[PDB]
Design a protein around this ligand. Structure first.
Ligand SMILES: NC(=O)C1=CN([C@@H]2O[C@H](COP(=O)(O)OP(=O)(O)OC[C@H]3O[C@@H](n4cnc5c(N)ncnc54)[C@H](OP(=O)(O)O)[C@@H]3O)[C@@H](O)[C@H]2O)C=CC1
Length: 343
């Protein structure tokens, strides 16, 4: 606790779902934290209402797509920042402007923050963790091949051009190219910068919000999947959603281990606990919250098993490297849905 509080951690996109959980666990370990936010309203909310700690401060970085967006942060604080967790990237399916709104901010946000480290903190930052995604390991078009296999070594095969069929496949591409850019940065700057890099690459991230916001009927994208199911009417049509799941608090823990442990240097950490279709989620919600039974859809129990749909995922290497057991779906669903209901 004494050694940790000598260390300042910079976290991009501090107001987001995953980043708040990261910052929560950083403050639990007595680290000092600087987070970037896009507005004073968001920054004040974090410092005044959520963390309430002298170990948390914020800075405004309005748009990560911008040339030199992170230069003022590292000019001011570069001498004190030993760890950088770059988590900020647009996750939104509501745009048709795939390059302007997804691909370019993802890539230039990642290139930009690393260039700013080189410019103002080349010998000060020891460790960087980039939040990548399962999307960087597979395109949407290769996610549902039961005869394939995804591992830490798998890369999304899409091109800048062909991922632009729709906002989901384009967002998947944005993660791929941004992660590629982070490793390429070290490829060309091995002798210019001290920091070592690792990436945390999650599947769909569920779990409780770090802080309930009274008037938010729309959560972040991954969390809004469960929010929708809880509020569907019994006869409503079912969304189509299928992937791996992982709990947000396991994601936060993995980000912190990824800068503390030396065996995680240079690793792509594939964070994944189990497979789901919407039926998997409906079965779990109905089972664990019987007060929703007959109020939300039941789907067709016994149908649409994710094993018969999705490409298998082998992340046994990541599990051994991290050395902790991931929360299972029943835990995730209990913690997530109970918080929604309590609000
Ligand atoms: N949730 C999931 O299932 C997964 C998430 N990820 C990655 O995790 C990270 C966080 O996503 P998550 O927490 O899930 O979703 P959130 O939407 O909660 O967090 C997104 C964050 O990115 C910030 N942001 C987006 N675009 C910009 C921009 N152009 N300039 C500055 N800040 C920006 C948002 O700022 P504001 O708060 O102002 O919008 C927000 O803080 C992202 O890199 C995402 O790709 C990876 C795999 C799965």
């Amino acid at each position: 606790t004494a050694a940790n509080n000598n260390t300042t951690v910079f976290v991009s996109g501090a107001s987001g779902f995953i980043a708040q959980h990261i910052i929560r666990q950083l403050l639990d370990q007595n680290y000092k934290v600087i987070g970037s936010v896009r507005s004073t309203e968001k920054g004040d909310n974090l410092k005044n209402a959520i963390f309430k700690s002298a170990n948390f401060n914020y800075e405004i970085v309005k748009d990560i797509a911008d040339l030199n967006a992170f230069d003022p942060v590292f000019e001011k604080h570069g001498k004190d920042i030993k760890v950088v967790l770059h988590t900020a990237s647009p996750l939104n399916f509501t745009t048709t402007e795939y390059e302007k709104d997804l691909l370019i901010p993802a890539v230039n946000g990642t290139k930009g923050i690393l260039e700013s480290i080189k410019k103002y903190a080349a010998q000060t930052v020891e460790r960087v963790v980039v939040t990548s995604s399962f999307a960087s390991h597979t395109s949407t078009v290769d996610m549902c091949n039961t005869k394939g296999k995804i591992t830490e070594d798998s890369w999304n095969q899409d091109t800048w051009e062909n991922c632009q069929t729709d906002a989901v496949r384009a967002y998947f591409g944005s993660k791929k190219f941004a992660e590629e850019a982070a490793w390429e940065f070290l490829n060309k700057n091995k002798d210019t910068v001290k920091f070592k890099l690792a990436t945390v690459d999650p599947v769909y991230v569920f779990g409780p919000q770090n802080h309930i916001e009274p008037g938010k009927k729309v959560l972040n994208v991954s969390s809004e999947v469960i929010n929708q199911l809880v509020h569907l009417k019994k006869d409503d049509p079912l969304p189509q959603v299928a992937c791996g799941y992982i709990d947000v608090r396991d994601i936060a823990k993995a980000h912190i281990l990824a800068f503390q442990k030396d065996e995680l240097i240079g690793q792509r950490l594939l964070l994944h606990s189990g497979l789901f279709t919407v039926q998997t989620l409906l079965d779990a919600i109905n089972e664990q919250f019987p007060e929703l039974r007959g109020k939300i859809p039941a789907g067709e129990p016994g149908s649409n098993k994710p094993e018969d749909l999705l490409t298998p995922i082998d992340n046994t290497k990541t599990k051994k490297l991290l050395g902790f057991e991931f929360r299972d779906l029943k835990t995730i669903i209990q913690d997530t849905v109970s918080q929604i209901l309590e609000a």
